[PDB]
Amino acid sequence: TVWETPIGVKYTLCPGSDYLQTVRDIQSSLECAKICDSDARCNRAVYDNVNKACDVKDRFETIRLTNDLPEGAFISTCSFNETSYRVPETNAEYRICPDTDYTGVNAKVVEGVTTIQACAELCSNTQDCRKSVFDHINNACAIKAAEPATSIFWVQDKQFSTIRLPENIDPAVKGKWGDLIRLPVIPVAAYIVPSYPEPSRLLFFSSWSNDAFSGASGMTQFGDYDFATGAISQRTVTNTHHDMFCPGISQLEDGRILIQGGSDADTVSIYDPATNEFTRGPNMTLARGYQTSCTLSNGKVFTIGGAYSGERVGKNGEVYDPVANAWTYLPGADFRPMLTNDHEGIWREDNHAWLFGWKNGSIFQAGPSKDQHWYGIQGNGTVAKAATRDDDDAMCGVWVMYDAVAGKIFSAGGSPDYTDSPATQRAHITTIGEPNTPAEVERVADMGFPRGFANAVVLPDGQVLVTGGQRMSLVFTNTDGILVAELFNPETREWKQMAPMAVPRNYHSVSILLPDATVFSGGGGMCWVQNVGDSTAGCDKTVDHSDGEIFEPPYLFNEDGSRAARPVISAISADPIKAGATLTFTVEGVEGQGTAALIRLGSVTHSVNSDQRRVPLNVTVSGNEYSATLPDDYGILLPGYYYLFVSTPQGTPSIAKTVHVIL
Numbered sequence: 164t165v166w167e168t169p170i171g172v173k174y175t176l177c178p179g180s181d182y183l184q185t186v187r188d189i190q191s192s193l194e195c196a197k198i199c200d201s202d203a204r205c206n207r208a209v210y211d212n213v214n215k216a217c218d219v220k221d222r223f224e225t226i227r228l229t230n231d232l233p234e235g236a237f238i239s240t241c242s243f244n245e246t247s248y249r250v251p252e253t254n255a256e257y258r259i260c261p262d263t264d265y266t267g268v269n270a271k272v273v274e275g276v277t278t279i280q281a282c283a284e285l286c287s288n289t290q291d292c293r294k295s296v297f298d299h300i301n302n303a304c305a306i307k308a309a310e311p312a313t314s315i316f317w318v319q320d321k322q323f324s325t326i327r328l329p330e331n332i333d334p335a336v337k338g339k340w341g342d343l344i345r346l347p348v349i350p351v352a353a354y355i356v357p358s359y360p361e362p363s364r365l366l367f368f369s370s371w372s373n374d375a376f377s378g379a380s381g382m383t384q385f386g387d388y389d390f391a392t393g394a395i396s397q398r399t400v401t402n403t404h405h406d407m408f409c410p411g412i413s414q415l416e417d418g419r420i421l422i423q424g425g426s427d428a429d430t431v432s433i434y435d436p437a438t439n440e441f442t443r444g445p446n447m448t449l450a451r452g453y454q455t456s457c458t459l460s461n462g463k464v465f466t467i468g469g470a471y472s473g474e475r476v477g478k479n480g481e482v483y484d485p486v487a488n489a490w491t492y493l494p495g496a497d498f499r500p501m502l503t504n505d506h507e508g509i510w511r512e513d514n515h516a517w518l519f520g521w522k523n524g525s526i527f528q529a530g531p532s533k534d535q536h537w538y539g540i541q542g543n544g545t546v547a548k549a550a551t552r553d554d555d556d557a558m559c560g561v562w563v564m565y566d567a568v569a570g571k572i573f574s575a576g577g578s579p580d581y582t583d584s585p586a587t588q589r590a591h592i593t594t595i596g597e598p599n600t601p602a603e604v605e606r607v608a609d610m611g612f613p614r615g616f617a618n619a620v621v622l623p624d625g626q627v628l629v630t631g632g633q634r635m636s637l638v639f640t641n642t643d644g645i646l647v648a649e650l651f652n653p654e655t656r657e658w659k660q661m662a663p664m665a666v667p668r669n670y671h672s673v674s675i676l677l678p679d680a681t682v683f684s685g686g687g688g689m690c691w692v693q694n695v696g697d698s699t700a701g702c703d704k705t706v707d708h709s710d711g712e713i714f715e716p717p718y719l720f721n722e723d724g725s726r727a728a729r730p731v732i733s734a735i736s737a738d739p740i741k742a743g744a745t746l747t748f749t750v751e752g753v754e755g756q757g758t759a760a761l762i763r764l765g766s767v768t769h770s771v772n773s774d775q776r777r778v779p780l781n782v783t784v785s786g787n788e789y790s791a792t793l794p795d796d797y798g799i800l801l802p803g804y805y806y807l808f809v810s811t812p813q814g815t816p817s818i819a820k821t822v823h824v825i826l
């Protein structure tokens with residue numbers, strides 16, 4: 164049986180079970196349960212039908228706390244009924260969420276506060292109190308330290324109640340986060356499934372466990388999130404003998420997803436959206452993990468680096484040809500020029516290269532190494548310096564091609580070492596034109612927050628949303644996770660701070676652009692255990708975030724906070740299209756002339772998204788009939804699957820329609 168209190172707390176009564184307070188003249192299970200709920204310390208109690216007594220820890224019956232979320236779960240909204248509370252003679256009202264805590268630095272902790280009301284009163288008498296916590300077990304009141312200088316998290320915990328002064332957030336300025344979406348496996352890696360008329364599914368994957376990894380295992384846990392309908396499922400992919408944790412990821416011309424190395428460091432898996440199945444690729448010429456791969460102008464996939472797994476040495480380039488179905492080793496694609504200097508040595512130094520497919524089968528490497536390089540696949544491979552981005556390495560910085568037409572790359576954050584490393588606020592616009600000629604680098608305004616292990620996406624208007632990351636790179640921690648998202652506007656070279664997300668998204672988190680021009684932010688954590696099947700019970704679960712949250716940017720909102728009217732792409736052929744061809748589509752529901760941009764479908768892991776890029780379009784209109792001449796350079800318009808967004812003149816985007824660019 165399950166009893167639900169008047170605020171929504173849940174207890175599970177199992178008649179016939181046994182396992183601080185012992186109350187007699189209790190007639191039933193329900194009564195003992197009501198005793199359990201009275202006591203902030205009570206997770207489990209025993210009803211004794213024989214002696215008619217209730218023990219707060221057959222002849223007996225057990226009572227167990229069983230909320231929809233477990234104790235210690237991060238929340239974005241009160242799980243239970245909230246109350247308002249105004250401090251007498253104050254004209255200052257607070258929301259109170261029972262059975263929850265605010266974790267993080269305290270401005271003050273005060274002993275001998277015996278009621279929630281006295282805790283609210285203390286908050287009212289403390290300058291700059293926006294969040295306080297009442298400790299039901301110890302009779303103490305904590306005032307939380309000021310945000311966003313400090314990061315404060317909202318956790319489900321019966322010991323406490325939270326007290327807050329609501330902040331008015333204008334979504335027309337700051338966007339809006341939805342609530343946490345619980346997932347079966349930590350989304351350490353994710354990709355949009357190509358589909359017509361628009362994608363509806365995000366696949367995501369961890370390792371052999373939903374919240375743990377080891378080494379080679381031959382299995383990956385996947386989740387499948389239909390963001391159209393909210394349906395979620397999971398599967399264990401074993402048929403490719405591939406633990407896909409810590410891989411390279413690239414989308415092929417035909418929208419198949421090439422997942423390369425990681426825990427099974429020499430294994431390759433190909434996801435086919437048409438079948439929803441994985442097939443074995445050919446083994447890589449070199450075993451690799453934590454490498455980046457990029458799809459090229461000719462549909463081949465280049466990769467370099469990957470010392471995380473396989474041999475613990477620098478890894479030269481190689482290239483996959485999906486038509487020959489072959490890997491070729493490229494020793495002339497030398498790892499040495501692209502190394503960082505890391506306190507953990509070569510294991511780290513060749514990891515997570517900022518790689519972009521460009522003109523004539525070239526590769527631009529934008530970082531994270533101080534120096535930028537051109538790589539190529541001709542002969543045995545090529546390498547040359549292109550520019551100096553910065554005076555330090557920015558390992559796991561964010562980076563995105565926000566304007567492929569103008570060769571524009573934005574990068575921000577990262578840390579000089581992979582871990583135990585203060586993150587930078589530095590940001591840069593890199594401009595590329597002719598491959599194997601100098602790049603240009605312009606330092607732009609610093610980020611408002613230092614961020615290691617952040618994520619970034621380009622939006623239809625060319626702005627870049629940076630989500631999560633932490634002030635100091637500390638693998639597998641929540642520590643000083645930034646919750647405030649930042650929007651960088653390349654037109655003004657300005658940052659704006661957005662609404663805060665609920666959960667820190669640091670190491671092993673992702674972000675990715677959804678077809679409604681919202682951003683999924685999720686994941687974080689994972690536990691290392693020595694062997695496949697070992698117990699995770701000794702793992703710090705507070706750093707695991709088997710969930711995500713979706714950000715609506717400012718462009719989705721009118722000045723009054725209502726949802727702005729979106730253009731509708733009412734008709735577009737599902738036929739593939741070549742570079743230089745004319746895309747035509749019908750647009751309804753726009754006042755004045757829409758703009759159009761293509762955004763390549765994303766794939767993401769370890770602060771690496773080598774599949775996304777924005778290709779802005781010029782359109783001409785005859786009535787409701789739009790036409791755009793696609794760039795004729797496959798270095799700009801990479802093959803594969805794209806979102807087509809039509810935006811109002813004020814910058815509100817349509818739901819995307821899928822466009823397939825072919826060779």
Ligand SMILES: *[C@@H]1O[C@H](CO)[C@@H](O)[C@H](O)[C@H]1NC(C)=O
Pocket residue numbers: 429430446447
């Ligand atoms: C992958 O293929 C290569 C070439 O046959 C082989 O020698 C290697 O052992 C294979 N490795 C794995 C890890 O399957």
Ligand code: NA
Pocket residue numbers: 503504505506556579580
């Ligand atoms: Na370093």
